[PDB]
């Protein structure tokens, strides 16, 4: 048995923190709340490979 | 008959005296303290009630609204000095406006 | 359910009638007056107790109440209350 | 041509309406849940009735309107109308806190 | 192990500064007036 | 009920409160300062309130308890619990 | 070195100093402050560390171990 | 007679320097004098009230410290 | 060449001197004369003790210095160094008068 | 006395006598004067320690009331406890506004 | 004449904590005023709370909650702990 943490919502901004791949600050926004998260550069590469933009859930 | 009637005092001298006796104030109480206390409370209550009734009647009312009480104590500078920290229930605030904001 | 409670309804009502037999009373204002008279009473009483405590006098008399009123009530009401109470004391003692 | 009042005209009439009225300006349920949650941390299993809440409400808004009034006095002393942070800071400092 | 996603508050967080923190407990106060005025005036 | 309740006081409530206080122009930072001072006043009152309640061996805080908690601070609220 | 950590402060580069960092590790017998010379600052910022947890620091290897 | 003016202006500037203020306006001195008059009158009211209550022709330290304590300034030290 | 200090620089050093000193700034004779004048226009043929005068002047200088930092804070709020009448009036109004 | 065996400096007997003659209540408890004397020990020890520390910091064996006033002032606990209390001939704290420099 | 003070009591308290520095006469008056001031404050508060529970007896718990409420949290808790320890040792 294990517990998992799940984040979802509408994207408001993509701000890279930039030798090395910098982290990215994401503006995940749901209908009942809003918060900003810092992502691992591997996750940054993965999300940029999804070709997402502002306003994409 | 009670001493209040023969002294023409509305407030109870006996009740004030017994409150003083069990009010842990002094083991020895003279007979002048209760009558003096009843007289001063009667005067203060009469003045307050008259002012409150004036504040009620100037507002087209025959009953003393607590707001009327608030105005009644507030216009008098002396009553304001007497109670500079009390909060009166359902009183609101004086209709004071500043002259600087007026266009 | 309830044994007994003490209120100043009677004397307040006769005060209102002898000064204005035309104005009604609201219950909230009545509680406000009850609190006001209670406050004034206990203030004066504790002041008189400590006042007997100043000069190490074990007796509390009308003089102590008089000077307490003069000290806590401002000059106008002080003189008014002490005059009324003193006159009351003289006629009450004259009644004997 | 829609009819729009110039800014500040309605402010005087809200002030006039509120100064003649003495009703509570805070919604009951938010205040009571605020009181419950702040009493939670001190000690659990609280109990509040219909009374014992309006007293807190009234004391609170009386204190707040007094604070707003002397904040207005301080702002007027600053030769301006709009209130600001330092106004309530020095009002609190001067009043005895 | 390492947390890939961390909650970050924009106005609070700053990569420039990293700060973390945890008979009667009373701090030490210097009562020397000369020291206090030296600190104030320098 | 037990989390994130301080923001229960709303912007129109503060606007009405200031209008009662006589202010016609409200800044953009006043709201959470007045919220913080309101919270401070509440905790200061409620601490003595619960002290009175528990020392009286009572499971509920009543209007008398708070009114004579305010009495000791000079507030001496009139009306309820006269 | 190891023990409960109670204080960690880290500052950005200024002309006066490239990196200033002070941390306080308290043990049952001891509680003192060390000076962080850049590299250990980067190592400590690599993973989130909160005061009040038992950690072990290997000076030679320069790695961080949380106990 | 006209002994209120005994408080000289340089004295007022001295208590101002106690408060850490550099410049002082002209009206400040007489306004402070009026505030002085009011404050001493208010204190002496209750002071002499207790004094005549104590059937004494001369004031006492305990009298004035207790009278001020009634107001709520809590003077400490002399006449404690 | 003459050695004249810039205006206000002597103010800092006199502030430093007066802050470390607990002595009273009022001469005994004018204070006693004022108190005796209050007695004279207050009640005829009054006597004063050697004591009951230190409390007077002590409470006065405490009140005066307190009101002085209140008015100093009010003045510095007004974005100016020089005090004025509105500063002291606002301080008196906010303190509880 | 009972104070000596209870580790008390101020006497419980005098406190109990004062409570009996203080016009508070006709009934006075037994452990209440002991508790009150203990708490008075507490505050007296705190204030004396603070005054002594203030005197030592000024390198003076004598304890001027300025030392005691500072002992009140730096510990905000005492200023909250004693806000309206004035200390005789204690002076004022060295406070200067930053903008005034 | 005879007059009562806490001179020797706080004197040997000071000697207990620090038998190297003295306290002056005006310091004696300051300390005396401080002690009887808090004494009467706690006394009247305790009288008020004891009489308010419709009881005419004051016990250790009444003054205990009095000192708990007047003093801030740290002083309140420390004083309560030391007082209850002293009273339990006494009885």
Author numbering:
A (entry chain V): 134 to 151, 161 to 199
B (entry chain E): 16 to 118
C (entry chain G): 33 to 128
D (entry chain B), I (entry chain A): 37 to 133
E (entry chain S): 1 to 22, 43 to 62
F (entry chain C): 21 to 102
G (entry chain U): 136 to 202
H (entry chain D): 23 to 102
Question: Which sentences from the paper describe this structure?
Answer:
The yeast SWR1 complex catalyses the exchange of histone H2A–H2B dimers in nucleosomes, with Htz1–H2B dimers. SWR1 is a 14-subunit complex that is a member of the INO80 remodeller family. Here we used single-molecule analysis to demonstrate two-step double exchange of the two H2A–H2B dimers in a canonical yeast nucleosome with Htz1–H2B dimers, and showed that double exchange can be processive without release of the nucleosome from the SWR1 complex. Cryo-electron microscopy analysis revealed different populations of complexes showing nucleosomes caught ‘flipping’ between different conformations without release, each placing a different dimer into position for exchange, with the Swc2 subunit having a key role in this process.
However, in light of the new single-molecule data above, we re-examined these less-populated structural states in an expanded dataset to see whether these provided information about how nucleosomes might flip between different conformations. Two classes were of particular interest and resulted in structures at 3.8 Å and 4.7 Å, respectively. One of these classes (described briefly in our previous work) was very similar to the major structure, but a longer section of overhang DNA is evident that emanates from the lower gyre of the nucleosome and binds across the surface of SWR1 (configuration I). The DNA extending from the upper gyre is unwrapped from the nucleosome and binds to Arp6–Swc6 in the same manner as that described for the main structure. A third contact region, involving eight conserved basic residues (K319–K322, R325, K326, K328 and K329), are in a loop that sits across the surface of the SWR1 complex. This surface contacts the DNA overhang adjacent to the nucleosome wrap, but a different overhang in structures emanating from either the lower (configuration I) or the upper (configuration II) DNA gyre. By swapping which DNA overhang is bound to SWR1, and then releasing the nucleosome but without releasing the DNA overhang, the nucleosome can flip and rebind in the opposite orientation but remain tethered to SWR1 by the DNA contact with the Swc2 subunit. Consequently, we interpret that the two major states that we observed by cryo-EM represent intermediates on the flipping pathway.
